[model samples]
Target: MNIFEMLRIDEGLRLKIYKDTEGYYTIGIGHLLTKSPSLNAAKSAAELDKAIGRNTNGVITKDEAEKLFNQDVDAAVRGILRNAKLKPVYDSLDAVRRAALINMVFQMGETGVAGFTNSLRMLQQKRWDEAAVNLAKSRWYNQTPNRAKRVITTFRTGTWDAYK
Candidate 1:
């Protein structure tokens, strides 16, 4: 599986708005509609709805969801690139490992992933198992065990078949 495939499995496609793990309004492939200023930049709910082609209470078509999902994935990719401290380590990673990092950023935002200081250090040191262990110790793991498991495994094994 590629990055998008793993994300589709992890995130689960949603055509309608729903509360995420953080209880924030989210839509499509984990696109935050509200309560996450770092990831979402819309000035108001109406504006956000306008941009996304649906109201907060409305549903979106599969194509619309795909559009949003692609954009959100790109944002996560850019998030890693924009991180001064994490950029070098991110660049050092293989495509599979890079996808894992991007998946973490997609799920938790870049700043949230940045909070994993020791995990980041271990990843930078090429200690894959240690990095995976460190990530498992976080609240993110507690909140999303299955998704975290796959991401951690990808980090440890440097493979795309975490689901298998």
Candidate 2:
């Protein structure tokens, strides 16, 4: 089965589940919710299932998954890019670096991501190790260590392999 199918929901619903749970839904690469009483209750019956129009078994299709993923990615990227552009250190980044930074931005947020401004400057200076260290020192690193580790690894390796 594909990753989305393995999660028991399509990518679209998965993203909604993530948002509804405040990034707390841990199905695969995501985190599991610890205190989402509302979301917990919502999934108690077939209501959420019917809402998302899943099969009787709550299994979502690949098409549905793709739709949700695209929507969430668009929204997420736009939000991150906007915040990045507003930061004082934004212009120092090239497009690819900016895209990589956007992932960090969405994972954290404006304030959280902007905390890496000094690191970005270090990166501009070709100080890769310092930049990678700085990427790992953010609040995101503490909150979501796995994701943070991957991002930091990418920064250090200068690769987009993590996305694969």
Candidate 3:
């Protein structure tokens, strides 16, 4: 599976507004309307719906969700590319491993992924097993065990089949 598909599985799509696990107003594919840097300012669900020009039902079309998904995915990819320390490892990885990193960035913001210093170092060294082990030790893994397992497996295997 590609990064987009992996994200669809992990994040899930919603045409209507819903609260995230953290209780923030989110819509489309994990698009946080509340206090998101991507947004100009915090907005309630209805406010965001009006801003996005969705109908009063606070729902967007699937194509609209895809538009948001593309933007979010681009942001995640750009976030990884912009990291000084992570950029080299990111560049060195094959597509599969790179997809794993992007998925991690997508799930947790770039800063959260950057917090995995040990795991990052191991990945930089191309120590797949070590990297996976280090990543598994994080609270991120604990928060979403299954997704983390797939990501870690992808890192260790350098294959997309885990996501499939």
Candidate 4:
């Protein structure tokens, strides 16, 4: 069996931008919008498992994407929470709640979430009804009703279900 095929498991492949785990823009796997190289040297990842196609678009296989995801997930998580304004509060949240907050904050941006001071406090205390109420009262809800509802639902529930 071909090694690429033998080791390959289907991975996410996208031709457009999507919000990543931390709610930042990513394209064609975990390539960060803020951090992708400017390609100052060779134009391709020819020897690298993942390669940019001749079209200057991204191209990668399952294994390549998985590798990207592993690194990206770590960096995204650490970066989002690193010396963040409410680092203590963020650290106090349950794992699932922290993840939920990260996802919400990703789309909202740190400065945006900074306005959720009360909500963050409530979340730290696991004050569901209060936090949920604040979420409903949030500008995030007003700005993107669909996203607010989806993410809030998961924030109130489990991590895997956060997208729901």
Candidate 5:
């Protein structure tokens, strides 16, 4: 069964079908869009898949699948960054601090991470112990706090492995 056959357009969701000036068929669902004459022959491949229980493998071709999947992953990553609640920390952090916090957010999904704001302030003031303490306040303290703390310590003591 084709994967598209599994898609269904629910209420509040919109689908647009169009052909570019180049004569290709393009379909847009919500904010997700794709183009291909082979793929566009049907309206809801997802719905079709659900009803027919058939795999749509190779229906859209590997190139099309790659493009579609990449778009979907990119969209999800953007959404994660957009909805993250650590914006204040992100905005106030220096480049190194921002990089560290982004790594935390990427691993912990924002909800599981904290303390970057205070940590950044401590780093800006050159208070090494305070910054390490603030970073250790996060949920990742034992598990991943070492990452940020190591960088902070590096900035303070010039040692990569002295974080604590």
Candidate 6:
């Protein structure tokens, strides 16, 4: 299965919008609700509401959300691949590591994962264990231990049993 499907399994399907554990309004596969600047900026309240279908109470079907998910993930992958630091060693990584990086970028965004300075540096140095260790030492590790371990294990071993 594709990584998006894997993420669906992990993140679970939530069609109805609800506040997440972190207290952000989230819906449609863990997409955090944010004031989308492009649509919000310079627009009047009525305009923004109309543009976003808020006139109809802000709801969407599974297909629409899945499409957004695919596009978002695709953009995240592009950003990760185009990253200057990652660009150098990008192709040298195996599938699992590449996948892990994509997920990391998706979860943290480019800027957030870029702050994984030591971890990315270690990976660049071909120090698998060190990279994993560095990841384990971060707040990301504290915030999401299970995910950290899973991704870190993929980094260290270059293979992961996604079924688990």
RMSD of each: 3.4, 6.5, 3.3, 8.1, 15.6, 4.3
TM-score of each: 0.89, 0.56, 0.87, 0.58, 0.36, 0.78
lDDT digits (tens) for residues 57-124 of candidate 4: 43455554665555655554564566456576567777666666665544545666767878777877
Candidate 1 clash pair list: none
**24-134 in candidate 3: lDDT tens per residue?**
678889876775545432346566666567553667788888888998999988999898866878887888788888988887788888888888888888998888897
lDDT tens per residue, model 2, 1-164: 22222223212234333432244442222222234556553363244355346632433455555544454445445665576443433455554455555565544446656556688678767677988897777666776676666567656766555545
- Which portions of model 5 miss their true places by more than 4 Å? 1-85, 114-129, 137-139, 144-164
Candidate lDDT (C-alpha), each: 0.82, 0.50, 0.81, 0.55, 0.43, 0.67
Tens-place lDDT digits, model 6, residues 1-164: 45675567556666555655544455567665554445332233344244345642345468756856786688777887778876655566766678778777767678788778777878977899888887899888888787777778878887666436
For model 4 the local lDDT of residue 65 reads: 60
Q: Candidates sorted by lDDT, descending order? A: 1, 3, 6, 4, 2, 5
Off by over 4 Å in 4: 1-13, 16-26, 29-31, 34-56, 158-164
lDDT of prediction 1: 0.82
RMSD of candidate 5 to true structure, Å:
15.6
Window of ten residues with lowest summed lDDT in model 2: 3-12
